[PDB]
Design a protein around this nucleic acid. Structure first.
Ligand SMILES: [Mg+2]
Ligand SMILES: [Mg+2]
Ligand SMILES: [Mg+2]
Ligand SMILES: [Mg+2]
Ligand SMILES: [Mg+2]
Ligand SMILES: [Mg+2]
Ligand SMILES: [Mg+2]
Ligand SMILES: [Mg+2]
Ligand SMILES: [Mg+2]
Lengths: 127, 80, 113, 60, 155, 78
RNA sequence: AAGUUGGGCACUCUAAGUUGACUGCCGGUGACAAACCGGAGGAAGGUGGGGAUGACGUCAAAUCAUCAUGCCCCUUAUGAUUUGGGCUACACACGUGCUACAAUGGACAAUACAAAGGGCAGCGAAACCGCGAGGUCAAGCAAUCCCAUAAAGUUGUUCUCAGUUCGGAUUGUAGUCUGCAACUCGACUACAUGAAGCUGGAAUCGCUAGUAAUCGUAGAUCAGCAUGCUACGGUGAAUACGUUC
């Protein structure tokens, strides 16, 4: 029983559901394996499934929105952990032993005024 | 009818929204609870100095807040 | 290698082998490649010893001549050394068109720096 | 020589697009606005002391 | 940083090859932010190893880093009121990170006219000796190992 | 450069279209460096600059399609 | 087909109004000195990440051409109004910026995923006539409507290591648009033209995680015209043991 796993990574929301059965992930009425366009490491967002000691627990048929593509990805990886812990609340003390469930470390930041790339400075000539 | 409100200050428009839903709900009218439309800003980045000492500037904004209220029951006790 | 003087390159695609000739290249070479049994398939110096006859008979029909009208650019240009502008005093005193004649690295018409 | 220029500008020298836009309380001919008809330093002392609306400071 | 020990915290998993130390040299061939053209070229430069070498590239790969593996460093230090060099043996975390640059810097130097084949001639001919980049690690391997000097210096 | 009437200035047309009657030669006094060459032009000079020059330029049968009285330059180089 | 049409479903982001981080009970031992390295559970580290905020003061630094201005000069001209030249001129010297020297590259058709913005004579669809720059008409209009397809990348065809199918510098013809008009003095399109150039001497800069680099998106200024400019997302590494210079 798992529902409403939101997932956020770099301005790209993702809402999921989890249905019991076997591991079959799917977003936006089309596949995953030939949607994540470069991303040969599709299996490395399934990797919380690797470390929850069970791979084929549930099916997802998830949703996603916005962002880029790996910015649009990798939050599914975050988004199934919230609903995964809501499937059984034991896992907080046993999924945060590899430190995985939630961290939102970074987004892009402001171009600082009179600069060029928000930390870079223009080149000054000489002395 | 979907009357629209937009104002510069942000507490003024909420007290106006609860004023208009107060004068609507105290009469018989099945009004929706007031709707937050997203509030748009616009930016004015400008040079401080008077002569050519550029690359030292500061920015301004102004922020219009936009609410939304709709009634669906024209009653004589909710006319104006 | 018969089109204008010679068409030197062999074993390329013909669609760019017809760029080495003057007056035709890379976009009207697609257009003038208009003949049955004429398609670029890495047979530049092959596949044609009579099929080449149509694709230069049409070039002789292709009114702009390729190489025979090398006199008309200097007809037009030398006609513009009647001292009006735009060729007049970019050649009689020799500066360069480009609207900035000494502020930047204008060396495409200058000899050296 | 600019008080002649303001005497020109609110009149019309009859062609379509010969005019231009100048500052209201000041008189600069460059870097003026169209939301305010002020100009980039004459806007600033009128954006301060609260007297123009809209304007919080910065830093969004 | 005069303040000490900025943390490391870098992770590197992999899809098929099951090795942390193979996702490092995908992170150095990748220039200009295009990870979307690295493992398309890298894994098409390892599947062409067994067609060029005698074996799978896995059991050749630790040999290929093992022979290119640098030993000794010469970090110059003006000792006590003098100025000349000192040999330093590298701490084992730093030495692979120093090590992997010599694959890619000479990958862009072998004129084989195909980068997924020019670069892979230094994993072949790396488990076997006298490659392209082994010459530099033997050139600097004897930089101060034979030229042993004041070896009581601090830094 | 468009269609629709290559934009001779009209007062210049007013001068030429009735100036072409007799065998007299009093040319322009214009300093309007804008107009093109209508093909019905008689042997006459012009005065096409206004800072300081009245350069008498020949109306001779050049490429008359140029949208300029630009035979008179403005400055020197050396 | 997709209009998200109904259901009126309302939860799921969502869009502007609220609860709570602080060395807190923490283990040490600094001997009670605050604090320092550690462990716990808030998603959260020890000013969570950034901005806005610029102390007494220096440089007789900069501005009378934003304005204000003590004082001296101009007084049928050192004022005024047009038209028309100029601010772009040229053997040269130096700053900044861009686009490139190629095969993890180029061409070619097909082929997915953003943020922030503006638009009531402005933005302009759909279908239409053009090689394109565009031309006509033309409904919808401020989360809903329009500009507005993001692009890089993926799968696939092909050129196969060359002054080259690399690059467009230059140069004539034939147009479009804005305008009263594009010669001095704009911009864009396709037609050929196709130069310099093989990752650059002495030297010299910019950056410590969403950071430099990569292709893009929007805006003001503005009838028309930016490689600059301030804003926004996408892809995203390597490295910092150390204070000797
Ligand atoms: Mg929920
Ligand atoms: Mg005055
Ligand atoms: Mg310290
Ligand atoms: Mg904070
Ligand atoms: Mg802070
Ligand atoms: Mg403070
Ligand atoms: Mg004065
Ligand atoms: Mg100037
Ligand atoms: Mg469209």
């Amino acid at each position: 029983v798992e529902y409403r796993g939101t997932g956020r990574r770099k301005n790209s929301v993702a809402r999921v559901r989890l249905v019991p059965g076997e591991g079959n992930i799917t977003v936006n009425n089309r596949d995953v394996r030939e949607y994540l366009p470069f991303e040969s490491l599709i299996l490395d967002l399934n990797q919380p499934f690797d470390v929850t000691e069970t791979k084929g627990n549930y099916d997802v048929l998830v949703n996603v929105h916005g962002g880029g593509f790996t910015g649009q990805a990798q939050a599914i990886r975050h988004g199934i952990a919230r609903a995964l812990l809501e499937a059984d609340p034991e896992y907080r003390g046993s999924l945060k032993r590899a430190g995985l469930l939630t961290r939102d470390p970074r987004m892009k930041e402001r171009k600082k005024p009179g600069l060029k790339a928000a930390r870079r400075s223009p080149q000054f000539s000489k002395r | 009818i979907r009357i629209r409100l937009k104002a510069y200050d942000h507490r003024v428009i909420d007290q106006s929204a609860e004023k208009i839903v107060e004068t609507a709900k105290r009469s018989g009218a099945d009004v929706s609870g007031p709707i937050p439309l997203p509030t748009e800003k616009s930016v004015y980045t400008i040079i401080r100095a008077v002569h050519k000492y550029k690359d030292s500037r500061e920015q301004f904004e102004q922020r219009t807040h936009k609410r939304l209220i709709d009634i669906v029951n024209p009653t004589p006790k909710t006319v104006d | 290698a018969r089109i204008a003087g010679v068409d030197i390159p062999r074993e390329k695609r013909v669609v760019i082998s017809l760029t080495y000739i003057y007056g035709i290249g890379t976009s009207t070479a697609q257009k003038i490649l208009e003949e049955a049994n004429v398609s670029a398939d890495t047979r530049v110096k092959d596949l044609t010893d009579d099929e080449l006859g149509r694709i230069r008979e049409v070039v002789d029909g292709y009114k702009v001549e390729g190489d025979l009208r090398r006199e008309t650019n200097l007809n037009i240009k030398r006609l513009m050394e009647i001292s009006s502008y735009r060729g007049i005093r970019h050649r009689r005193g020799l500066p360069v068109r480009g609207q900035k004649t000494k502020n930047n690295a204008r060396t495409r018409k200058g000899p050296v720096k | 020589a600019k008080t002649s220029m303001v005497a020109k500008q609110q009149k019309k020298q009859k062609y379509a697009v010969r005019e231009y836009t100048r500052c209201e309380r000041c008189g600069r001919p460059h870097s003026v606005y169209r939301k305010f008809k002020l100009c980039r330093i004459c806007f600033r002392e009128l954006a301060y002391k609260g007297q123009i609306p809209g304007v919080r400071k910065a830093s969004w | 940083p005069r303040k000490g020990s900025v943390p490391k915290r870098d992770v590197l998993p992999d899809p098929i090859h099951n090795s942390k130390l193979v996702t490092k040299l995908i992170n150095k061939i990748m220039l200009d932010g295009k990870r979307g053209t690295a493992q398309r070229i890298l894994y098409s430069a390892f599947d062409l190893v067994e067609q060029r070498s005698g074996r799978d590239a896995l059991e050749v790969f630790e040999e290929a880093i093992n022979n290119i593996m640098p030993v000794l460093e010469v970090k110059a230090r003006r000792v006590g009121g003098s100025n000349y060099q000192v040999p330093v043996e590298v701490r084992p975390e730093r030495r692979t990170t120093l090590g992997l640059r010599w694959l890619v810097n000479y990958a862009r130097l072998r004129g084989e006219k195909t980068m997924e084949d020019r670069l892979a001639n230094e994993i072949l001919d790396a488990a076997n000796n006298t490659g392209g980049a082994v010459k530099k690690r033997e050139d600097t391997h004897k930089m101060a190992e034979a030229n042993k000097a004041f070896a009581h210096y601090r830094w | 450069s468009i269609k629709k009437g290559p934009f001779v200035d009209e007062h210049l047309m007013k001068k030429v279209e009735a100036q072409e009657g007799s065998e007299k030669k009093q040319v322009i006094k214009t300093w309007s460096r804008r107009s093109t060459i209508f093909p019905n032009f008689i042997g006459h000079t012009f005065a096409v600059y206004d800072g300081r020059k009245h350069v008498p330029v020949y109306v001779t049968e050049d490429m008359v399609g140029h949208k300029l009285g630009e035979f008179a330059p403005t400055r020197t180089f050396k």
